[PDB]
Structure 1
Amino acid sequence: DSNSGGEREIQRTMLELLNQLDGFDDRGDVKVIMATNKIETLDPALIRPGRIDRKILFENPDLSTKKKILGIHTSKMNLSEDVNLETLVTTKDDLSGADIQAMCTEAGLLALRERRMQVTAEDFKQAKERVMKNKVEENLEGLY
């Protein structure tokens, strides 16, 4: 809204990053790394083949690596006797790294409002179920 640029900004911007690698030859020093959500809609010239020879794809971590992230945030957390770390990892399905610490934050605030030392297992159960479905519960149409 505030800063637009019009249709002419697309040509002078995306091609300016190309003119940095295309307009200069630097053997060993400058290493340009580009990152965004979707690189497909970008200009194939902006990709500048031959400078970037490696394509790295991102995927969500599996259940084996979730215990390493969960154990760090729960290292300073007081857990009850009925709370198991293997249960929260199995419940998580298609979640990012910030979603692991989100359930620990939500379950920690529930016991903080009630002033409890060890967080009860009921807070962990309500955290993993709620954070699972919040924004989009249904496909809204058909089964897909």
Structure 2
Amino acid sequence: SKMNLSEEVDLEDYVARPDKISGADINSICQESGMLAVRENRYIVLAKDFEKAYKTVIKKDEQEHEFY
């Protein structure tokens, strides 16, 4: 929201999928991912930009189903 709706982000981008990662991703990484909407091929940001932002600089940690 700081960058007004990620500089006019599209509707079909919601963070519900790329936030419920349980992969740390400190607020600094969150700000970096927000600024990784710098893909200026278009004037709007899509869910692909967020997916690439989460894909870069990340460590694979998963498997909560055993604990639950």
**Count of residues in correspondence between the two structures:** 60
Q: Does 1:101 align with 2:31?
A: yes
Matches within 5 A, 1:48-87: 71-73=1-3, 75-87=5-17
CA contact (8 A) 1:74 1:104 kept: no
Q: Could you list the runs of 5+ residues in structure 2 that have no partner in the other structure?
A: 61-68
Specify whether residues 92 and 102 from structure 1 end up closer, same or farther in structure 2 by C-alpha distance, changes over 3 A only.
farther
CA contact (8 A) 2:6 2:45 kept: no
Q: Could you list the runs of 5+ residues in structure 1 that have no partner in the other structure?
A: 1-70, 138-144
Structure possessing the higher relative contact order (Cα contacts under 8 Å, 6 or more residues apart): 2
Cα offsets for 1:45-64 (capped at 9, x unmatched): xxxxxxxxxxxxxxxxxxxx
Cα offsets for 1:56-102 (capped at 9, x unmatched): xxxxxxxxxxxxxxx44564522112101222211351122111111
Q: Percent identity?
A: 15
Specify whether residues 132 and 105 from structure 1 end up closer, same or farther in structure 2 by C-alpha distance, changes over 3 A only.
same
Q: TM-score, normalised by structure 1?
A: 0.35
User: Which 4+ residue blocks in structure 1 deviate beyond 6 angstroms?
Assistant: none
Partner of 1:121: 47
In 2: Cα distance, 1:72 partner to 1:128 partner: 19
In 2: Cα distance, 1:126 partner to 1:79 partner: 15
